[PDB]
Symmetry: C2
Subunit: 169 residues, 2 copies
Amino acid sequence: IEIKDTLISEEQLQEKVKELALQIERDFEGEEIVVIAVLKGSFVFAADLIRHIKNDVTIDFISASSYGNQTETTGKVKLLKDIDVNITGKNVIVVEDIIDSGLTLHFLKDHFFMHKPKALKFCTLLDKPERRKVDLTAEYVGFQIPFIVGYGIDCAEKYRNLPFIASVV
Amino acid sequence: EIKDTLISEEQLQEKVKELALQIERDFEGEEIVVIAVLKGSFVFAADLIRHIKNDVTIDFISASSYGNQTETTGKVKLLKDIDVNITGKNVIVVEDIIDSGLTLHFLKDHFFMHKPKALKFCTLLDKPERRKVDLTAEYVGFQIPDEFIVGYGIDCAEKYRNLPFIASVV
Ligand SMILES: [Mg+2]
Ligand SMILES: [Mg+2]
Protein backbone atom coordinates (compact mmCIF):
# COMPACT_ATOMS: atom_id res chain seq x y z
CA ILE A 1 0.00 0.00 0.00
CA GLU A 2 1.57 3.22 -1.21
CA ILE A 3 0.33 6.74 -1.59
CA LYS A 4 -0.18 7.95 -5.15
CA ASP A 5 -1.32 11.59 -5.27
CA THR A 6 -2.60 14.28 -2.95
CA LEU A 7 -6.35 14.65 -3.65
CA ILE A 8 -7.37 17.35 -1.21
CA SER A 9 -4.70 19.44 0.45
CA GLU A 10 -4.35 20.34 4.09
CA GLU A 11 -5.22 23.97 3.29
CA GLN A 12 -8.29 22.98 1.21
CA LEU A 13 -9.51 20.85 4.08
CA GLN A 14 -9.09 23.65 6.61
CA GLU A 15 -10.96 26.14 4.40
CA LYS A 16 -13.80 23.72 3.69
CA VAL A 17 -14.19 22.72 7.31
CA LYS A 18 -14.44 26.45 8.29
CA GLU A 19 -17.14 26.89 5.66
CA LEU A 20 -19.17 23.87 6.85
CA ALA A 21 -19.01 25.25 10.38
CA LEU A 22 -20.43 28.57 9.20
CA GLN A 23 -23.30 26.75 7.46
CA ILE A 24 -24.04 24.83 10.69
CA GLU A 25 -23.93 27.98 12.86
CA ARG A 26 -26.41 29.67 10.50
CA ASP A 27 -28.89 26.79 10.66
CA PHE A 28 -28.85 26.67 14.46
CA GLU A 29 -28.50 30.30 15.49
CA GLY A 30 -28.79 30.75 19.28
CA GLU A 31 -29.17 27.06 20.07
CA GLU A 32 -27.20 24.15 21.50
CA ILE A 33 -26.03 21.36 19.24
CA VAL A 34 -25.08 17.75 19.86
CA VAL A 35 -22.42 16.44 17.50
CA ILE A 36 -22.20 12.67 17.18
CA ALA A 37 -19.12 11.43 15.41
CA VAL A 38 -19.02 7.97 13.85
CA LEU A 39 -15.77 6.34 14.95
CA LYS A 40 -13.12 5.90 14.02
CA GLY A 41 -12.63 7.80 10.78
CA SER A 42 -14.46 10.97 11.47
CA PHE A 43 -12.50 11.93 14.62
CA VAL A 44 -10.07 14.32 12.91
CA PHE A 45 -12.80 16.06 10.93
CA ALA A 46 -14.92 16.31 14.08
CA ALA A 47 -12.08 17.77 16.12
CA ASP A 48 -11.51 20.50 13.49
CA LEU A 49 -15.18 21.16 12.75
CA ILE A 50 -16.33 21.72 16.32
CA ARG A 51 -13.54 24.20 17.05
CA HIS A 52 -15.04 26.54 14.46
CA ILE A 53 -18.56 26.22 15.86
CA LYS A 54 -19.34 28.93 18.41
CA ASN A 55 -22.60 27.43 19.61
CA ASP A 56 -22.67 25.40 22.79
CA VAL A 57 -21.62 21.98 21.50
CA THR A 58 -21.87 18.58 23.17
CA ILE A 59 -19.95 15.82 21.42
CA ASP A 60 -20.26 12.08 21.70
CA PHE A 61 -19.25 9.05 19.70
CA ILE A 62 -20.86 6.01 18.22
CA SER A 63 -19.20 2.80 16.99
CA ALA A 64 -20.88 0.15 14.86
CA SER A 65 -19.59 -3.03 13.23
CA SER A 66 -20.71 -5.15 10.34
CA TYR A 67 -22.60 -8.41 10.57
CA GLY A 68 -21.11 -9.54 7.20
CA ASN A 69 -23.03 -9.69 3.87
CA GLN A 70 -26.13 -8.43 5.64
CA THR A 71 -24.35 -5.11 6.30
CA GLU A 72 -23.15 -4.65 2.69
CA THR A 73 -26.72 -5.06 1.39
CA THR A 74 -28.99 -3.84 4.21
CA GLY A 75 -26.78 -1.62 6.41
CA LYS A 76 -27.70 -3.66 9.50
CA VAL A 77 -24.86 -3.11 11.94
CA LYS A 78 -24.11 -4.12 15.50
CA LEU A 79 -23.84 -1.22 17.90
CA LEU A 80 -20.50 -1.58 19.64
CA LYS A 81 -20.68 1.69 21.50
CA ASP A 82 -23.99 3.51 21.81
CA ILE A 83 -24.30 7.18 22.81
CA ASP A 84 -24.05 8.36 26.43
CA VAL A 85 -25.52 11.82 25.93
CA ASN A 86 -29.11 12.84 25.87
CA ILE A 87 -30.32 13.82 22.40
CA THR A 88 -34.08 13.81 23.21
CA GLY A 89 -35.48 17.14 21.95
CA LYS A 90 -31.99 18.23 20.87
CA ASN A 91 -30.45 19.36 17.62
CA VAL A 92 -28.21 16.60 16.41
CA ILE A 93 -25.55 16.58 13.72
CA VAL A 94 -24.05 13.17 12.86
CA VAL A 95 -20.55 13.52 11.53
CA GLU A 96 -18.98 11.11 9.07
CA ASP A 97 -15.81 10.96 7.07
CA ILE A 98 -17.52 9.32 4.10
CA ILE A 99 -20.96 8.47 2.90
CA ASP A 100 -21.22 6.13 -0.08
CA SER A 101 -24.04 3.51 -0.12
CA GLY A 102 -25.62 5.27 2.87
CA LEU A 103 -26.94 1.88 4.12
CA THR A 104 -25.19 1.95 7.45
CA LEU A 105 -25.92 5.62 8.12
CA HIS A 106 -29.59 5.02 7.26
CA PHE A 107 -29.62 2.26 9.89
CA LEU A 108 -27.92 4.60 12.37
CA LYS A 109 -30.50 7.26 11.48
CA ASP A 110 -33.35 4.98 12.57
CA HIS A 111 -31.51 4.22 15.80
CA PHE A 112 -31.14 7.92 16.63
CA PHE A 113 -34.76 8.64 15.78
CA MET A 114 -35.75 6.19 18.54
CA HIS A 115 -34.20 8.75 20.93
CA LYS A 116 -36.60 11.45 19.60
CA PRO A 117 -34.26 14.33 18.76
CA LYS A 118 -35.66 17.74 17.79
CA ALA A 119 -33.61 17.68 14.57
CA LEU A 120 -31.16 15.21 13.01
CA LYS A 121 -28.85 16.23 10.22
CA PHE A 122 -25.87 14.58 8.58
CA CYS A 123 -22.48 16.16 7.94
CA THR A 124 -19.86 14.29 5.90
CA LEU A 125 -16.42 15.35 4.80
CA LEU A 126 -16.66 13.28 1.62
CA ASP A 127 -19.72 12.15 -0.36
CA LYS A 128 -20.14 9.63 -3.20
CA PRO A 129 -23.79 9.97 -4.15
CA GLU A 130 -23.27 7.73 -7.22
CA ARG A 131 -22.77 4.86 -4.77
CA ARG A 132 -26.09 5.25 -2.94
CA LYS A 133 -28.14 2.13 -2.30
CA VAL A 134 -30.72 4.08 -0.28
CA ASP A 135 -32.18 7.56 -0.09
CA LEU A 136 -29.95 9.66 2.11
CA THR A 137 -28.95 13.23 1.42
CA ALA A 138 -26.44 14.84 3.73
CA GLU A 139 -27.20 18.45 4.65
CA TYR A 140 -23.51 19.35 4.96
CA VAL A 141 -20.99 17.98 2.47
CA GLY A 142 -17.32 18.90 2.20
CA PHE A 143 -16.32 17.34 -1.12
CA GLN A 144 -17.81 15.09 -3.77
CA ILE A 145 -15.14 12.62 -4.80
CA PRO A 146 -14.90 9.87 -7.41
CA PHE A 147 -9.76 4.41 -2.35
CA ILE A 148 -8.49 7.29 -0.27
CA VAL A 149 -6.62 7.79 2.99
CA GLY A 150 -5.63 10.60 5.36
CA TYR A 151 -7.28 13.09 7.71
CA GLY A 152 -8.65 10.27 9.92
CA ILE A 153 -9.36 7.81 7.07
CA ASP A 154 -7.31 4.62 6.91
CA CYS A 155 -6.29 1.73 4.69
CA ALA A 156 -5.91 -1.31 6.96
CA GLU A 157 -5.54 1.03 9.98
CA LYS A 158 -2.74 2.99 8.34
CA TYR A 159 -2.45 6.63 7.15
CA ARG A 160 -5.06 8.19 9.45
CA ASN A 161 -2.47 10.72 10.51
CA LEU A 162 -1.88 12.39 7.13
CA PRO A 163 -2.91 16.04 7.28
CA PHE A 164 -4.25 15.79 3.69
CA ILE A 165 -6.36 13.30 1.72
CA ALA A 166 -4.60 11.12 -0.86
CA SER A 167 -5.21 8.38 -3.40
CA VAL A 168 -3.53 5.00 -2.85
CA VAL A 169 -3.45 1.59 -4.55
CA GLU B 1 -18.94 29.91 33.40
CA ILE B 2 -15.52 30.53 31.89
CA LYS B 3 -13.14 32.67 33.86
CA ASP B 4 -9.79 33.15 32.11
CA THR B 5 -7.86 31.75 29.17
CA LEU B 6 -5.08 29.57 30.66
CA ILE B 7 -3.36 28.28 27.52
CA SER B 8 -4.07 29.91 24.19
CA GLU B 9 -4.86 28.26 20.90
CA GLU B 10 -1.46 29.32 19.54
CA GLN B 11 0.42 28.05 22.62
CA LEU B 12 -1.33 24.70 22.23
CA GLN B 13 -0.39 24.43 18.57
CA GLU B 14 3.28 25.23 19.26
CA LYS B 15 3.51 22.78 22.17
CA VAL B 16 1.80 19.98 20.28
CA LYS B 17 4.32 20.42 17.43
CA GLU B 18 7.15 20.19 19.95
CA LEU B 19 5.80 17.01 21.57
CA ALA B 20 5.54 15.44 18.13
CA LEU B 21 9.22 16.22 17.50
CA GLN B 22 10.18 14.57 20.81
CA ILE B 23 8.20 11.47 19.83
CA GLU B 24 9.75 11.30 16.33
CA ARG B 25 13.22 11.43 17.93
CA ASP B 26 12.58 8.58 20.31
CA PHE B 27 11.27 6.32 17.53
CA GLU B 28 13.51 7.15 14.64
CA GLY B 29 12.91 4.72 11.77
CA GLU B 30 9.94 2.91 13.36
CA GLU B 31 6.17 2.58 13.17
CA ILE B 32 4.13 3.76 16.16
CA VAL B 33 0.77 2.84 17.62
CA VAL B 34 -1.03 5.75 19.29
CA ILE B 35 -3.73 4.84 21.78
CA ALA B 36 -5.90 7.75 22.83
CA VAL B 37 -7.93 7.63 26.05
CA LEU B 38 -11.47 8.78 25.16
CA LYS B 39 -13.14 11.09 25.29
CA GLY B 40 -11.00 14.02 26.37
CA SER B 41 -7.83 13.32 24.51
CA PHE B 42 -9.41 13.17 21.02
CA VAL B 43 -8.61 16.77 20.03
CA PHE B 44 -5.04 16.57 21.28
CA ALA B 45 -4.60 13.23 19.50
CA ALA B 46 -5.98 14.53 16.23
CA ASP B 47 -3.49 17.44 16.33
CA LEU B 48 -0.52 15.46 17.64
CA ILE B 49 -0.59 12.68 15.07
CA ARG B 50 -0.75 15.11 12.15
CA HIS B 51 2.73 16.37 13.10
CA ILE B 52 4.20 12.86 13.42
CA LYS B 53 5.75 11.72 10.16
CA ASN B 54 6.37 8.13 11.22
CA ASP B 55 3.84 5.47 10.15
CA VAL B 56 1.14 5.79 12.78
CA THR B 57 -1.70 3.42 13.71
CA ILE B 58 -4.26 4.96 16.03
CA ASP B 59 -6.85 3.28 18.25
CA PHE B 60 -8.95 4.26 21.24
CA ILE B 61 -9.64 2.99 24.73
CA SER B 62 -12.48 3.92 27.04
CA ALA B 63 -12.45 3.33 30.81
CA SER B 64 -14.89 4.39 33.49
CA SER B 65 -14.74 4.80 37.23
CA TYR B 66 -16.06 2.37 39.79
CA GLY B 67 -16.52 5.24 42.31
CA ASN B 68 -14.33 5.83 45.41
CA GLN B 69 -12.29 2.75 44.47
CA THR B 70 -11.14 4.56 41.32
CA GLU B 71 -10.19 7.73 43.22
CA THR B 72 -7.99 5.74 45.65
CA THR B 73 -6.74 2.76 43.62
CA GLY B 74 -7.18 3.69 39.91
CA LYS B 75 -9.22 0.61 39.30
CA VAL B 76 -11.35 1.35 36.27
CA LYS B 77 -13.78 -0.63 34.20
CA LEU B 78 -12.70 -1.11 30.59
CA LEU B 79 -15.65 0.03 28.51
CA LYS B 80 -13.89 -0.31 25.18
CA ASP B 81 -10.70 -2.25 24.80
CA ILE B 82 -8.31 -1.88 21.87
CA ASP B 83 -8.85 -3.56 18.52
CA VAL B 84 -5.34 -3.18 17.12
CA ASN B 85 -2.40 -5.44 17.65
CA ILE B 86 0.25 -3.85 19.89
CA THR B 87 2.29 -7.02 20.50
CA GLY B 88 5.95 -6.16 19.72
CA LYS B 89 4.94 -2.61 18.77
CA ASN B 90 5.91 0.85 19.94
CA VAL B 91 2.97 2.28 21.83
CA ILE B 92 2.25 5.82 22.95
CA VAL B 93 -0.78 6.29 25.19
CA VAL B 94 -2.25 9.76 24.83
CA GLU B 95 -4.09 11.58 27.61
CA ASP B 96 -5.49 15.02 28.14
CA ILE B 97 -4.59 15.03 31.84
CA ILE B 98 -2.61 13.07 34.36
CA ASP B 99 -3.12 13.97 38.01
CA SER B 100 -3.12 11.16 40.55
CA GLY B 101 -1.84 8.79 37.84
CA LEU B 102 -3.77 5.95 39.46
CA THR B 103 -5.92 5.26 36.41
CA LEU B 104 -3.14 5.42 33.91
CA HIS B 105 -1.01 3.08 36.07
CA PHE B 106 -3.88 0.61 35.88
CA LEU B 107 -4.14 1.08 32.09
CA LYS B 108 -0.38 0.58 31.88
CA ASP B 109 -0.65 -2.91 33.44
CA HIS B 110 -3.46 -3.74 31.00
CA PHE B 111 -1.39 -2.82 27.95
CA PHE B 112 1.65 -4.70 29.27
CA MET B 113 -0.45 -7.86 29.15
CA HIS B 114 -0.38 -7.41 25.33
CA LYS B 115 3.46 -7.42 25.33
CA PRO B 116 4.32 -4.27 23.41
CA LYS B 117 7.93 -3.57 22.41
CA ALA B 118 7.68 -0.18 24.16
CA LEU B 119 4.99 1.74 26.05
CA LYS B 120 5.19 5.42 26.81
CA PHE B 121 2.76 8.06 28.04
CA CYS B 122 2.01 11.43 26.48
CA THR B 123 -0.21 13.95 28.24
CA LEU B 124 -1.22 17.44 27.29
CA LEU B 125 -1.50 18.51 30.92
CA ASP B 126 0.27 17.22 34.03
CA LYS B 127 -0.38 17.87 37.73
CA PRO B 128 2.51 16.03 39.42
CA GLU B 129 1.57 17.54 42.80
CA ARG B 130 -1.55 15.39 42.67
CA ARG B 131 0.29 12.05 42.20
CA LYS B 132 -0.82 9.14 44.36
CA VAL B 133 1.37 6.69 42.50
CA ASP B 134 4.75 6.72 40.79
CA LEU B 135 4.15 7.66 37.14
CA THR B 136 6.28 9.97 35.08
CA ALA B 137 4.96 10.70 31.61
CA GLU B 138 7.68 10.72 28.98
CA TYR B 139 5.92 13.53 27.08
CA VAL B 140 4.26 16.44 28.86
CA GLY B 141 2.74 19.54 27.30
CA PHE B 142 2.12 21.78 30.28
CA GLN B 143 2.27 21.68 34.03
CA ILE B 144 -0.83 23.30 35.45
CA PRO B 145 -1.93 24.20 38.97
CA ASP B 146 -4.57 22.01 40.63
CA GLU B 147 -7.64 23.73 39.22
CA PHE B 148 -10.68 22.88 37.04
CA ILE B 149 -10.10 23.43 33.35
CA VAL B 150 -12.04 23.06 30.12
CA GLY B 151 -11.46 23.30 26.37
CA TYR B 152 -9.48 21.53 23.65
CA GLY B 153 -11.39 18.26 24.21
CA ILE B 154 -11.73 18.61 28.00
CA ASP B 155 -15.21 19.12 29.43
CA CYS B 156 -17.09 20.14 32.53
CA ALA B 157 -20.30 18.09 32.60
CA GLU B 158 -19.87 17.40 28.84
CA LYS B 159 -19.68 21.16 28.11
CA TYR B 160 -16.85 23.21 26.55
CA ARG B 161 -14.90 20.45 24.71
CA ASN B 162 -15.09 22.60 21.60
CA LEU B 163 -13.09 25.59 22.83
CA PRO B 164 -9.88 25.98 20.78
CA PHE B 165 -8.02 27.06 23.94
CA ILE B 166 -7.85 25.88 27.57
CA ALA B 167 -9.61 27.96 30.22
CA SER B 168 -10.32 28.11 33.92
CA VAL B 169 -13.95 27.93 35.08
CA VAL B 170 -15.26 28.88 38.61
MG1 LIG C 1 -17.00 6.49 8.54
MG1 LIG D 1 -8.46 11.75 29.88
